[PDB]
Amino acid sequence: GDRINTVRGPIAISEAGFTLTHEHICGSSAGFLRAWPEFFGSREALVEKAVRGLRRARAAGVRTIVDVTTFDLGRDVRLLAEVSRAADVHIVAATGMWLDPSLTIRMRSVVELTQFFLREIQHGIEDTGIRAGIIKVATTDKMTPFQELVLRAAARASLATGVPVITHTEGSQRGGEQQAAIFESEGLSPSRVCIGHSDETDDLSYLTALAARGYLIGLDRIPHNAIGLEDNASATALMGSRSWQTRALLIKALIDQGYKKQILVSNDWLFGMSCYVTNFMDVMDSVNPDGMAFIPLRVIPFLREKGTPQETLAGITVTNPARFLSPTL
Amino acid sequence: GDRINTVRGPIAISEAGFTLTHEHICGSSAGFLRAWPEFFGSREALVEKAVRGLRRARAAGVRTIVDVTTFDLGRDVRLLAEVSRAADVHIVAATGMWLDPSLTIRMRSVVELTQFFLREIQHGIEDTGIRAGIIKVATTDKMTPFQELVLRAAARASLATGVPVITHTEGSQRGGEQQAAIFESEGLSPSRVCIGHSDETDDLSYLTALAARGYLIGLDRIPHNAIGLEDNASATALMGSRSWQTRALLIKALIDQGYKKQILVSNDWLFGMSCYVTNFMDVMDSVNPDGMAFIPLRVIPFLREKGTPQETLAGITVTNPARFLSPTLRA
Ligand SMILES: C[As](C)(=O)[O-]
Numbered sequence: 001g002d003r004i005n006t007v008r009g010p011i012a013i014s015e016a017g018f019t020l021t022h023e024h025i026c027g028s029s030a031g032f033l034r035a036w037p038e039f040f041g042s043r044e045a046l047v048e049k050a051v052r053g054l055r056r057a058r059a060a061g062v063r064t065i066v067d068v069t070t071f072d073l074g075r076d077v078r079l080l081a082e083v084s085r086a087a088d089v090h091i092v093a094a095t096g097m098w099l100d101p102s103l104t105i106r107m108r109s110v111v112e113l114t115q116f117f118l119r120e121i122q123h124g125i126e127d128t129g130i131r132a133g134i135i136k137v138a139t140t141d142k143m144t145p146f147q148e149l150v151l152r153a154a155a156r157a158s159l160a161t162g163v164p165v166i167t168h169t170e171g172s173q174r175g176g177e178q179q180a181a182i183f184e185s186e187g188l189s190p191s192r193v194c195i196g197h198s199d200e201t202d203d204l205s206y207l208t209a210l211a212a213r214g215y216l217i218g219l220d221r222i223p224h225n226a227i228g229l230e231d232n233a234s235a236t237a238l239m240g241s242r243s244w245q246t247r248a249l250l251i252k253a254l255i256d257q258g259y260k261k262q263i264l265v266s267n268d269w270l271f272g273m274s275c276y277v278t279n280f281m282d283v284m285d286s287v288n289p290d291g292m293a294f295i296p297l298r299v300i301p302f303l304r305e306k307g308t309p310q311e312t313l314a315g316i317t318v319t320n321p322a323r324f325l326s327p328t329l
Numbered sequence: 330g331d332r333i334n335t336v337r338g339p340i341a342i343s344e345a346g347f348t349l350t351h352e353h354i355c356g357s358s359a360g361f362l363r364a365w366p367e368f369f370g371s372r373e374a375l376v377e378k379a380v381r382g383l384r385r386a387r388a389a390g391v392r393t394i395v396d397v398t399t400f401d402l403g404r405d406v407r408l409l410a411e412v413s414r415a416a417d418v419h420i421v422a423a424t425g426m427w428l429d430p431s432l433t434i435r436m437r438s439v440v441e442l443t444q445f446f447l448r449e450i451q452h453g454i455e456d457t458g459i460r461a462g463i464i465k466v467a468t469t470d471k472m473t474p475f476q477e478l479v480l481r482a483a484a485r486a487s488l489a490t491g492v493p494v495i496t497h498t499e500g501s502q503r504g505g506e507q508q509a510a511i512f513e514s515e516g517l518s519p520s521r522v523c524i525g526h527s528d529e530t531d532d533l534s535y536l537t538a539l540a541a542r543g544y545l546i547g548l549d550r551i552p553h554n555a556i557g558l559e560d561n562a563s564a565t566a567l568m569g570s571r572s573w574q575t576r577a578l579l580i581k582a583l584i585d586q587g588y589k590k591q592i593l594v595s596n597d598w599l600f601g602m603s604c605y606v607t608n609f610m611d612v613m614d615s616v617n618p619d620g621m622a623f624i625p626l627r628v629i630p631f632l633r634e635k636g637t638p639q640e641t642l643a644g645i646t647v648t649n650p651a652r653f654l655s656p657t658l659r660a
């Protein structure tokens with residue numbers, strides 16, 4: 001209610017500071033980092049790259065990241081704990097479920113998924129005692145039956161704990177609306193929900209409608225663009241053609257519509273990546289050398305150039321994440 | 330060559346004894362036992378049940394089991410080591426890949442799959458130093474393109490190390506033939522391959538043809554029969570409608586055809602199971618209270634009553650697993 005759980009323990013709301021609400025130390029799959037660490041060079045190579053990247057972000061103003069890596073995205077909470085300490089940046093760990101649930105997970109019911117999410121929030125992740133401070137879910141272009149089950153369990157978990165829900169959206173079929181519908185069917189308050197990856201579209205009518213219903217809007221893939229890489233069908237299919245300025249202009253567009261309190265901005269960056277083509281991390285790094293420092297080094301000065309008040313920018317990067325992460329019913 | 334790697338270390342071929350070549354301590358998914366141990370009551374409860382069942386198997390004559398639980402089936406090699414030590418039963422761990430590879434696995438090349446399998450065979454599983462003694466692969470009714478990749482990687486890993494390959498088959502479209510074709514195209518000897526879940530069909534002609542080519546035949550699901558309960562469609566869809574005696578007669582049939590040296594017999598049992606419906610483990614346990622002791626307590630006596638000679642039954646349970654598991658790159 002006035003404290004948030006991090007991988008180093010509980011902190012006061014005021015200690016969060018500049019917060020990136022959608023990031024990753026490592027994007028992977030369940031158990032993979034432990035079974036084949038040499039895929040990332042080594043576990044130590046990954047730690048070192050991540051510590052280095054978080055220090056760069058820290059030097060640029062970032063105090064806290066929310067790692068929205070879930071069980072099926074290969075979340076390694078011990079990795080998060082080590083990297084948090086070494087880089088001296090707060091990290092909030094996630095529960096929930098992304099788009100790659102294993103057979104065991106796909107066989108579970110809403111009540112079983114709720115119990116799993118609650119365990120990671122209320123008791124801790126694995127045998128670490130480290131508690132989730134956020135619930136991450138995801139749907140495809142069209143939501144599948146199992147995805148709905150995850151969203152219902154997430155709502156049930158949120159209603160029992162006050163922990164907020166962040167979503168992954170994709171495609172053209174306005175996924176956020178499908179999700180919002182399920183959430184409200186479970187009686188979940190929109191103010192507890194961040195509809196993520198919303199900068200992926202230029203449909204401003206879609207975002208304002210969601211915001212007008214009280215939903216937080218996640219503009220979290222700002223640096224993700226092919227800044228001179230069309231000779232990679234893999235990149236264009238997982239990055240895009242809209243420049244980071246185009247994505248950044250949605251932030252100001254929503255501000256101008258009166259929704260500054262509903263905006264959450266992030267990089268959706270990572271330091272290791274195994275769930276796409278080999279070495280794609282190198283391609284991402286070539287495009288955005290700033291890493292998680294992209295938002296404070298590039299996006300923030302840009303919005304200020306376009307006339308955005310310091311009061312507003314401070315509110316988006318500090319107040320909004322604080323209000324959102326603070327457990328509330 | 331003369332040594333097999335177990336979760337407690339290397340052992341001489343001659344120490345393996347009565348070996349069950351297709352079993353599981355726990356059937357799950359990657360990372361699941363560590364993330365939600367309470368699904369199995371507790372990790373501690375799972376250990377206690379596994380030790381209990383392994384000791385009963387040991388009492389009935391079993392000295393070694395091959396745990397063919399892969400990465401994607403949630404293999405926990407530390408769990409295996411712990412139950413092996415407590416029960417005093419050798420356990421051989423697996424590498425390879427079953428039917429549920431994650432997105433990371435599905436994105437990898439044959440080269441990378443091969444390297445991962447080789448890592449688990451040559452250096453160790455995770456950070457434990459425990460090396461895999463078998464490669465486990467699987468295909469569905471109609472083999473998919475990624476499954477082919479996994480089989481090719483397994484062939485390449487086998488050729489580099491001499492470690493054998495065990496397969497999962499399912500469906501009616503003779504998957505073992507699809508598998509054999511891929512292995513041989515990579516240059517793998519059928520003598521390094523056990524085509525598993527072969528007792529799922531009564532097609533004896535399909536089996537003798539495989540055995541004639543030099544393949545080991547895994548009759549590994551003998552107690553998996555839904556006979557005794559018809560009010561469980563989940564149990565009929567995963568177990569069977571044929572009797573265990575029927576499955577066990579396939580053993581005698583293949584011996585009678587002259588293929589005693591190619592036969593590998595097992596229960597394909599487990600002590601925990603999260604891959605299916607909740608408490609499906611309870612259903613299996615009610616059908617087969619003997620667990621992994623089903624083969625030595627029921628199937629071996631049944632075969633003696635069928636007039637299968639003792640020396641033959643011993644060759645199947647002792648000599649055939651030893652020859653199979655012993656790392657071999659002929660000549
Ligand atoms: C690239 As993602 C769906 O793990 O934020």
Ligand SMILES: C[As](C)(=O)[O-]
Nearest residue numbers: 353356402497597
């Ligand atoms: C039931 As199985 C495919 O894990 O032997």
Ligand SMILES: [Zn+2]
Nearest residue numbers: 167168169197
């Ligand atoms: Zn996402």
Ligand SMILES: [Zn+2]
Nearest residue numbers: 022023068268
């Ligand atoms: Zn993400």
Ligand SMILES: [Zn+2]
Nearest residue numbers: 496497498526
């Ligand atoms: Zn199988």
Ligand SMILES: [Zn+2]
Nearest residue numbers: 352353397597
């Ligand atoms: Zn099996």
